[PDB]
Write a protein that binds this ligand. Structure first.
Ligand code: WNM
Ligand code: WNM
Ligand code: ZN
Length: 140
């Protein structure tokens, strides 16, 4: 579990979005495993605006933050998981690291702020849904 809180937005994995999220929907994209809902309180997170490929992510199944190198966002085949069939996911970054289904929502951060959230795992990789291209998260 986990979310990003920026302005009056909450960014969650689409597959973990609640009824309240869907009832307050701003934007969602199944291909990216992202959903954004509206919030009452202002959030603490700053979104990175950069093409970093190094950062640190939170792994809830280890209670640990790990430094990782990660691929630039691209369109990647993902094998079946507990929460999706095998399918293509867009805007996905991969690193070598541990990720189980419950790790989804852990933040990946670089020197510029939040890069994305854990979205995929298995076969010794962790996949992150990028948010750095969502410039609208920083206004209105
Ligand atoms: N290698 C490229 C092509 C696929 N990716 S992407 O991150 O899925 C993506 C999709 C659409 C718009 C912008 C980015 C980047
Ligand atoms: N192995 C894959 C096959 C599709 N799922 S699913 O989308 O997580 C799912 C789980 C339970 C009921 C309906 C859908 C995982
Ligand atoms: Zn950066």
């Amino acid at each position: 579990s986990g979310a990003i809180y920026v302005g009056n937005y909450r960014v969650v994995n689409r597959h973990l979005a609640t009824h309240n999220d869907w009832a307050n929907l701003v934007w969602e994209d199944s291909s990216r495993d992202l959903l954004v809902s509206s919030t009452t309180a202002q959030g603490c997170d700053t979104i990175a605006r950069c093409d970093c490929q190094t950062g640190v992510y939170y792994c809830s199944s280890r209670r640990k933050h790990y430094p990782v190198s990660f691929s630039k966002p691209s369109l990647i085949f993902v094998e079946a998981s507990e929460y999706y069939p095998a399918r293509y996911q867009s805007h996905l970054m991969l690193a070598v690291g541990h990720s189980e289904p419950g790790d989804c929502g852990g933040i990946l951060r670089c020197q510029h702020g939040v890069v994305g959230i854990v979205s995929t795992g298995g076969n010794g990789l962790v996949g992150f849904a990028d948010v750095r291209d969502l410039l609208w998260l920083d206004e209105e």
